[PDB]
RNA sequence: GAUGUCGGCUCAUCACAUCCUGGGGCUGAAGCCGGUCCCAAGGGUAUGGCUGUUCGCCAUUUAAAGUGGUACGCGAGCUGG
RNA sequence: GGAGGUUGGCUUAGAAGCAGCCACCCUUUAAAGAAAGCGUAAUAGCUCACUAGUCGAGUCGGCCUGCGCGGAAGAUGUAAC
């Protein structure tokens, strides 16, 4: 989520229940990964047929946090709970359905998936 | 280059040179006969 | 034989600017070429002119060579205007600017300077006028830092000699 | 045209159309492959249609291309003095079983000294040094 | 008639025999990548699972996770496995 | 500058003067390596010797020895007069 050994619920279709941010990608010391953000993620939890399964090493984009994201104009956006949704190699999301909210931050050209599937 | 400590005439169109203290060896025919010093 | 130990042997268009510490030369065709002459160095002056050393030391028969053969193209270049045949791929050429286009997607321009002229006789070639060489073979050679030849096809500028290294892959 | 001397040629006599024992043979020191069908067939059928008798040409490009005399076939007829057709493994120590001059002389009888010797018992020595091509020594 | 260990922590400082970034030569260098050798010390140069570890082996990063000297730098700075 | 015959070899898009294989002298007559090897990697362009008219000179290799030049990179700061 933010940062490594962070637990964070999955807002994607298949699989996960909850994932565990092993690395945050992006720089060198990089420490926090907000919304938008790529982490390398394990499985913890999952369902018991799913596309996923417990204890994998996955790529996840972080769509909604606890800390927040900010707008230009100073305010803030700010859930109550981490989430994330898992992505294949391609960074394409694995499931079909997006549960929750997700901001929109995340409608850009790689994450627009996630944006027309959400119920926001 | 080729750094060596010792130049030579590798072929009969490389020519030794003393150039500015350095023994270079140039060559007009191909570059990989070309060294620096020795 | 040696080189500076014949006399010149210079054309009769060319007038002298006979100093003994310097040397001026001027003509038609170019002019204001001179040369500030060492110390280690005699001018012996006839219906032609010859050098010579002062004193036995190496230093000065290279000295005395050189000076004879950077008059020697200073005479001719008063004479003849001095060229070299560019060959590359596009010229578009203005005047005291010259505009190229080598590989790049930068399309970069080069200046000549005062003295030097540049003008494109035929499609693709460079042609160059100057009456001195040091000067001509200078802005050759200004050319050819944008872009050298490449082994496996080539492109570009080149010399007007073909030494060109090529290789296979 | 530039030429240095004893140039090699893998052709046909009297028609320029068999390629491969050559192929592509022109490329860089002398003039085309297809129009050499009319400079052998001035001189024919005395000279040994169809076994292999080598050659040294020499090249113009000025239609026109004449070669070094030797009326008589005495390099593979000397092959043919001894009796094989392959040739010695390794040339002058190991051997077939070597020819002697006595079997010489069918081929000096008409070859002609006057444009290849000095008179008509030199040339018979022109082959004591032919037959030193083959794995053979001649000896007499 | 005492100069109190190994490692971690904290703080470093210098070297260049350069790990990354910068400039080049040659290539059995098409390009994308490389190989190798020069020049270059300005700034950068992981996080964890195991183990007391240095190392090492692994997981995932990174432009890169350099090699050495400094009482195998540093306990009147810490820890004390 | 340049030979007056007819594939100098078990091979067959392609096998000289450079492939695991080897080499010394016979002319219409003043004329010359059946070759030590970079070439348009190979074939239709081209380089060390001339028994020579013509440009006209002091050169080309080795040995002995004098003093020097590269080979020569390090950690606090020039820092081996």
Do not use: W
């Not at chain 1, 989430?83 to 999301?93: G, R």
């Not at chain 3, 040696?2 to 003509?27: M, T």
């Not at chain 4, 080598?54 to 070094?68: G, K, L, Q, W």
């Not at chain 4, 005495?74 to 094989?84: F, H, R, W």
């Amino acid at each position: 989520m933010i940062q490594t050994q962070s637990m964070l619920d999955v807002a994607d279709n298949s699989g996960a229940r909850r994932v565990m941010c092993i690395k945050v990608l992006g720089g060198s010391h990089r420490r926090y990964a907000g919304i938008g953000d790529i982490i390398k993620v394990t499985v913890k939890e999952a369902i018991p047929r799913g596309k996923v399964k417990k204890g994998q090493v996955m790529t996840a984009v972080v769509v909604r946090t606890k800390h927040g994201v900010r707008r230009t104009d100073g305010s803030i956006i700010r859930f109550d709970g981490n989430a994330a949704v898992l992505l294949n190699n391609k960074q394409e999301p694995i499931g079909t359905r997006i549960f929750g909210p997700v901001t929109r931050e995340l409608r850009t050209e790689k994450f627009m998936k996630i944006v027309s599937l959400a119920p926001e | 280059m080729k750094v060596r400590a010792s130049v030579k005439k590798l072929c009969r169109n490389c020519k030794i040179i003393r150039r500015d203290g350095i023994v270079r060896v140039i060559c007009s025919a191909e570059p990989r006969h070309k060294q620096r010093q020795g | 034989s040696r080189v500076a130990k014949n006399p010149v042997k210079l054309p009769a268009g060319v007038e002298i600017k006979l100093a003994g510490q310097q040397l001026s030369i001027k003509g038609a065709k170019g002019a204001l070429e001179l040369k500030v002459h060492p110390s280690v160095e005699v001018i012996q002056d006839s219906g032609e002119l010859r050098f010579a050393a002062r004193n036995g030391d190496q230093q000065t028969r290279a000295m005395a060579g050189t000076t004879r053969a950077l008059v020697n193209n200073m005479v001719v270049g008063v004479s003849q205007g001095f060229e070299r045949k560019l060959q590359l791929v596009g010229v578009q050429a203005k005047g005291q600017v010259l505009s190229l286009s080598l590989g790049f997607s930068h399309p970069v321009d080069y200046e000549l300077p005062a003295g030097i002229v540049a003008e494109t006789p035929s499609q693709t070639d460079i042609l160059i006028k100057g009456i001195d060489k040091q000067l001509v073979g200078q802005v050759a050679a200004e050319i050819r830092d944008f872009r050298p030849p490449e082994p496996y096809k080539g492109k570009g500028v080149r010399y007007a000699d073909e030494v060109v290294r090529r290789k296979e892959a | 045209k530039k030429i240095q001397a004893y140039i090699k040629l893998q052709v046909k006599a009297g028609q320029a159309n068999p390629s491969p024992p050559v192929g592509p043979a022109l490329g860089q020191h002398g003039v085309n492959i297809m129009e050499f069908c009319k400079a052998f067939n001035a001189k024919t059928q005395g000279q040994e249609p169809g076994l292999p008798t080598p050659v040294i040409i020499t090249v113009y490009s000025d239609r026109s291309f004449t070669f070094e005399t030797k009326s008589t076939p005495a390099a593979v007829l000397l092959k043919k003095a001894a009796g094989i057709t392959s040739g010695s493994a390794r040339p002058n120590s190991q051997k077939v079983g070597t020819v002697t001059r006595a079997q010489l002389e069918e081929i000096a009888k008409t070859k002609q000294a006057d444009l290849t010797a000095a008179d008509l018992d030199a040339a018979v020595r022109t082959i004591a040094g032919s037959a030193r091509s083959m794995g053979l020594n001649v000896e007499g």
